[PDB]
Amino acid sequence: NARAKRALVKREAKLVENVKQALFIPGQSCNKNLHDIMVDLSALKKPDMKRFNRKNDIHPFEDMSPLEFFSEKNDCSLMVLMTSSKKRKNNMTFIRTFGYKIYDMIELMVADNFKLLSDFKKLTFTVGLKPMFTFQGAAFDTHPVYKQIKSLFLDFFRGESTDLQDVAGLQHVISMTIQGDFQDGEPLPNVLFRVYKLKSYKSDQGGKRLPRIELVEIGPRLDFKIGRIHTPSPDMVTEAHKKPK
Amino acid sequence: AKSSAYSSRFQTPFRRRREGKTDYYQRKRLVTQHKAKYNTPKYRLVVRFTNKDIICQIISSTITGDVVLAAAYSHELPRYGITHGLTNWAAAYATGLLIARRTLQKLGLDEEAVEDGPRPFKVFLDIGLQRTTTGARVFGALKGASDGGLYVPHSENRFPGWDFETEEIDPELLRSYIFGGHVSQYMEELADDDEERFSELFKGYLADDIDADSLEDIYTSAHEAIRADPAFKPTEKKFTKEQYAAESKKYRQTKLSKEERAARVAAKIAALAGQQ
Amino acid sequence: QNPMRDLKIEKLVLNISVGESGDRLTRASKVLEQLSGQTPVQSKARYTVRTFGIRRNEKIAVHVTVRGPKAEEILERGLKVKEYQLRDRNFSATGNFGFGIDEHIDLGIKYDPSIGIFGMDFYVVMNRPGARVTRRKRCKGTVGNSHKTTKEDTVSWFKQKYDADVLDK
Amino acid sequence: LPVTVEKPIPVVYDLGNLAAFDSNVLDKNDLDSSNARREEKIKSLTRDNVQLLINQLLSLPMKTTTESVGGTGGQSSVMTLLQLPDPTTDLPREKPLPKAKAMTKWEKFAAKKGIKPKERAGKMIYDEASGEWVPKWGYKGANKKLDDQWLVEVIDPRTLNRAERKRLVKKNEKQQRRNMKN
RNA sequence: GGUUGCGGCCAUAUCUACCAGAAAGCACCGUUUCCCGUCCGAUCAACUGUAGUUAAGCUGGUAAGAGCCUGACCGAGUAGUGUAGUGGGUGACCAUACGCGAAACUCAGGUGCUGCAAUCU
RNA sequence: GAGAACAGAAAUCUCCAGUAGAACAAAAGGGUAAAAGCCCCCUUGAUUUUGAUUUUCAGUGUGAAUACAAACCAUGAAAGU
């Protein structure tokens, strides 16, 4: 009389909201290494994430019925898919919604340089925790789609925005450094999935107070090519960028 | 005998479910540490009740699957003097002491934590598929961990010696318990009446004739020894992987190749149903 | 080969049905209590049949599950009074049988008509070394397809120890 | 061992989510695919960046708590922790404001008719001829006081009591279905 | 490496029949004061490997076994969807042609790998 | 179904088992299998203290309730719920 009512009042909105939930329903085409791809690449938002079992012959960017249906029905906001073809080979969907509708649909050509976490020496980790991000390049702020993919990761890998924090579970980071300069109207630089850590050491000039941080490369060292991009309404900005008050 | 649609649609349980080695339902209530205050590492406890083994460990949850950092055993007893009872209640309490001492020395405090301070730990327990009750060896081992130097959130309503009608902790019975009261009391209350059961139990202790007083001297000396040294230097592993696999690999079956198995099919088409 | 694999008894469950709830049920049941020691519980009549005298959640089933040396004794009595011979049927596909004795008066006590002296039915359970995988919650596992006693093995066992005979197959 | 890097465009921080953003320029092929020094070079650049991070993110205000074991929405004694500001960015929400506003034809009554909504004191009300406290509604209480006693001194009128109450709560339900349709 | 413990991913992972199970964890299975649990030592629990320990526990092969993954644009640049028109047009419309885009059957390949404390003659 | 002498087509005990059609204040694409599917124990919840909605003729250094947070609350050994 209250189970799917506690669940329902969770599913209901909030003012100072919770974390946002992800959705991974395989398309009509996958591969074993793609099973590996999903696990290793989304391997941090576990728990708060959704996976599926079967496949779909689907077109995401034309109509927006089916995955909207699935997401409304599973209470989530972060749709993902891996769409494959001969021409649009490896043109995956990393799309965020807004209010069970969709804000902007993003498809990245996922490059063929798949370097998994087992591609290097295994390490430890504190699972699920909230990561750090670094973003180098003025294109991360002057290139609209670089801004889009930036904020996409910034709201997917964001985690629970909680004031209190402790150095201990503050270990891991993404390194974002775009593949060089650009100009508008030409072939584009690509993004680098660069999962690294921050390891503490005396600076001999920072010493006890200021450490010296060293990162270790373990993977999964992946790359991202841009794909097909949407550009939603400005009323979307009116509803999306405000305050509860 | 199952059909085609049945077994071409149906679903499997989990692999670690196929065995009695994980209660994922509580693993999902633990992987949620709270989990909404803020980030702070996991310190969990794993106990398994196996014959001849006292398996008590402390894991780190990782994407590489797990890295159990802390571990306890039974074979490091001769250095503490008492060696028998690799399972019993004295064993539970003793290893609860010993894990405390080793993890103490491996933090390296007694005689990164950024500028403040020592920060003593709080290690919990994920119950596993052993049920939780009172009056047993599990919570005696918990007492051992506590009085060694762990700090576990719990109540004493579980400590053997706990009264649940009039909520009474019996410090006298617990003291007798600790110095060898219930076990050696069973020994003598069986021995004043019969020797066959008395002999069946304490298979060497019957031959060394150690009375409760002397095994409580063992208790004391071993307590002070645990507090002294968490040394725990393991086996040298004589006859390494090569010779271990000489044993474990001299009588193992390997794959029968496609040419051989197709020749077995050739047998099937020549003599079996190929008209004798 | 039989190094250790035998067919020891696990438990003897009685199966008594009543077409009424009252002093009759409780009379045969107090008889059960003096017989066993563990008070014969009440189990619900599943739901009404209306032809047999039963309704829903009535608590009309009373079964006792006997173990321990008392079990060997009650089986020796409950075959001796059966003349060490039972009927053709009741051999379970598991290696057991459920058979009944008319008028339990036939052994021991006197009648006392006003306490409950009726006909009863037993159902035995066996076991094989290796079959304790069901009982232990942990190590939840399987058994061999041939390592489990069946109808052939319960005919074998009705021939085997306790030296029982079958009354025309 | 160093602490200060050179940023020809000095970097920015956004700490509610533990982030830093640089607006410096990169040569086209400095980070390209065909590099076998891709690891060393890009990892050294972001190494300088995260050096900047950890030199920045340590002299902040904290929150020491003088309470000991048992801190419900908080900590034990032994630690001292670091806090987070709000990031200078508005990340995507999930909904509009979870609003619920209406009139339900009763709110207009509360306003125009000078009716202050009641104070909801409690439930266990005192019923004479009993000698006890029994709730206005909650244990066969002051609600059900006619389907209990033995004679009423006025077709049984008890069933009539119950059916009248059913008509009442149904009128409640009709005027609630209206309010939830509007 | 056997595996003890935890797993990561959840049928290559299970079910169907053997054989091997040579070391040690691994189990089967004997006892019952006090802690104890219920209708019961059925489960827990006081004892060691105790009495029985390879028959299940358990891995493997053994079997084109049943069921499941990958690839052959293999179908397939398929149909088709908006992209040129007084092309086609009495009508249920198909084209050239460009964005994109097959799917299944099909033809074969395979029926579990990693990490940390541990014991091996 | 194999079983199942009083008792059988529907009275009580095992087994293979239906991966469920487990049973859901359902309707779901789905979906919990040590379960939301039964019963055995435990208890009060309409607590109070503070910012936003307003708001009273002693327009009550916030009195009224709404939402949110804590503080306590019951449970459990326990992190938890």
Swiss-Prot record, chain A:
One of its GO terms (biological process) is assembly of large subunit precursor of preribosome. It comes from the Eukaryota. The keyword Nucleus applies. Coiled coil: none annotated. One of its GO terms (cellular component) is nucleolus. Residues 20-235 form the Brix domain. The keyword rRNA-binding does not apply. One of its GO terms (molecular function) is 5S rRNA binding. Signal peptide: none annotated. Keywords: Nucleus, Phosphoprotein. The modification Phosphoserine is found at residue 65. It is found in: Nucleus, Nucleolus. Part of a complex that includes BRX1, RPF1, RPF2 and SSF1 or SSF2. Component of a hexameric 5S RNP precursor complex, composed of 5S RNA, RRS1, RPF2, RPL5, RPL11A/RPL11B and SYO1; this complex acts as a precursor for ribosome assembly. Required for biogenesis of the 60S ribosomal subunit. Present with 32400 molecules/cell in log phase SD medium. Belongs to the RPF2 family. This is Ribosome biogenesis protein RPF2. It comes from Saccharomyces cerevisiae (strain ATCC 204508 / S288c).
Swiss-Prot record, chain B:
It is found in: Cytoplasm; Nucleus. One of its GO terms (biological process) is cytoplasmic translation. Disulfide bonds: none annotated. Its main location: cytoplasm. Gene3D superfamilies: 3.30.420.100. GO terms for molecular function: 5S rRNA binding; structural constituent of ribosome. SUPFAM superfamilies: Translational machinery components (SSF53137). InterPro entries: Rbsml_uL18_euk, Ribosomal_uL18_C_euk. One of its GO terms (cellular component) is cytoplasm. Component of the ribosome, a large ribonucleoprotein complex responsible for the synthesis of proteins in the cell. The small ribosomal subunit (SSU) binds messenger RNAs (mRNAs) and translates the encoded message by selecting cognate aminoacyl-transfer RNA (tRNA) molecules. The large subunit (LSU) contains the ribosomal catalytic site termed the peptidyl transferase center (PTC), which catalyzes the formation of peptide bonds, thereby polymerizing the amino acids delivered by tRNAs into a polypeptide chain. Belongs to the universal ribosomal protein uL18 family. This is Large ribosomal subunit protein uL18. It comes from Saccharomyces cerevisiae (strain ATCC 204508 / S288c).
Curated annotation (Swiss-Prot), chain C:
It comes from Saccharomyces cerevisiae (strain ATCC 204508 / S288c) (Baker's yeast). Its main location: cytoplasm. The keyword Membrane does not apply. InterPro entries: Ribosomal_uL5, Ribosomal_uL5_C, Ribosomal_uL5_CS, Ribosomal_uL5_dom_sf, Ribosomal_uL5_N. N-terminally acetylated by acetyltransferase NatA. GO terms for biological process: cytoplasmic translation; ribosomal large subunit assembly; translation. Belongs to the universal ribosomal protein uL5 family. Component of the large ribosomal subunit (LSU). Mature yeast ribosomes consist of a small (40S) and a large (60S) subunit. The 40S small subunit contains 1 molecule of ribosomal RNA (18S rRNA) and 33 different proteins (encoded by 57 genes). The large 60S subunit contains 3 rRNA molecules (25S, 5.8S and 5S rRNA) and 46 different proteins (encoded by 81 genes). Component of a hexameric 5S RNP precursor complex, composed of 5S RNA, RRS1, RPF2, RPL5, RPL11A/RPL11B and SYO1; this complex acts as a precursor for ribosome assembly. This is Large ribosomal subunit protein uL5A. The modification N6,N6,N6-trimethyllysine is found at residue 70. Pfam families: Ribosomal_L5, Ribosomal_L5_C. Present with 39000 molecules/cell in log phase SD medium. There are 2 genes for uL5 in yeast. It is found in: Cytoplasm; Nucleus. The keyword Protease does not apply. Keywords: Acetylation, Cytoplasm, Methylation, Nucleus, Ribonucleoprotein, Ribosomal protein, RNA-binding, rRNA-binding. SUPFAM superfamilies: RL5-like. The gene is RPL11A. PROSITE patterns: RIBOSOMAL_L5. GO terms for molecular function: RNA binding; rRNA binding; structural constituent of ribosome.
Curated annotation (Swiss-Prot), chain D:
One of its GO terms (cellular component) is nuclear periphery. The keyword Nucleus applies. This is Regulator of ribosome biosynthesis. It comes from Saccharomyces cerevisiae (strain ATCC 204508 / S288c). Component of a hexameric 5S RNP precursor complex, composed of 5S RNA, RRS1, RPF2, RPL5, RPL11A/RPL11B and SYO1; this complex acts as a precursor for ribosome assembly. Its main location: nucleus. Disruption phenotype: Depletion causes defects in processing of pre- rRNA and assembly of ribosomal subunits. The gene is RRS1. It is found in: Nucleus. Required for ribosome biogenesis. One of its GO terms (biological process) is ribosomal large subunit biogenesis.
